[PDB]
């Protein structure tokens, strides 16, 4: 396979339809509902793409970054955030180090392989 991917988004509907995408594509691909659950999946142990929501209730994408840190989760994986136009600031300055690339909801199918590819030979490469 070419690779494991967790995508953390709040909506179902996302996550079925990334999973669909990417698994067809040739990836492995695993779910989270929320920051928390993103910790949850990481503390299991997980090496490869975190697509990431950054506009998610309670614990937004930011606080799941900051999570990540304080928990040192952080080796081992490319996190690629998915944004918006109306997207929330980090609270915390240079949280941004640890984000890869960011791609605009909504987004095509192919920018979604496209990226994830990519970045997944900047995880098997490093
Ligand atoms: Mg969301």
Same mark, same amino acid.
């Given at each position: 396979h070419k690779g494991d991917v967790? /995508? *953390? %988004? %709040?909506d179902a509907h996302v996550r /079925?339809? *990334?999973?669909? /995408? =990417? #698994? %067809?594509?040739? !990836?492995?691909?695993? #779910? $989270?509902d929320s920051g928390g659950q993103c910790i @949850? =999946?990481?503390?299991?142990? !997980? #090496?490869? &793409? &975190? =697509?990431? %929501?950054?506009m998610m209730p309670g614990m937004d994408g930011w606080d799941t970054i900051? $999570? /990540?840190? @304080?928990? #040192?989760?952080?080796?081992?994986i490319a996190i690629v955030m998915l944004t918006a136009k109306n997207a929330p600031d980090a609270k915390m300055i240079g949280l941004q180090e640890y984000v890869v690339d960011y791609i605009?909801?909504?987004?095509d199918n192919e920018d979604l392989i496209e990226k994830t590819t990519f !970045?997944?030979?900047?995880?098997?490469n490093q």
């Amino acid at each position: 396979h070419k690779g494991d991917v967790m /995508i *953390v %988004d %709040d909506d179902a509907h996302v996550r /079925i339809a *990334v999973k669909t /995408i =990417l #698994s %067809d594509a040739g !990836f492995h691909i695993i #779910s $989270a509902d929320s920051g928390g659950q993103c910790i @949850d =999946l990481l503390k299991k142990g !997980f #090496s490869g &793409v &975190v =697509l990431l %929501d950054i506009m998610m209730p309670g614990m937004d994408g930011w606080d799941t970054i900051r $999570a /990540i840190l @304080d928990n #040192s989760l952080e080796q081992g994986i490319a996190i690629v955030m998915l944004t918006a136009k109306n997207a929330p600031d980090a609270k915390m300055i240079g949280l941004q180090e640890y984000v890869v690339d960011y791609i605009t909801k909504p987004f095509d199918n192919e920018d979604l392989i496209e990226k994830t590819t990519f !970045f997944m030979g900047f995880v098997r490469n490093q």
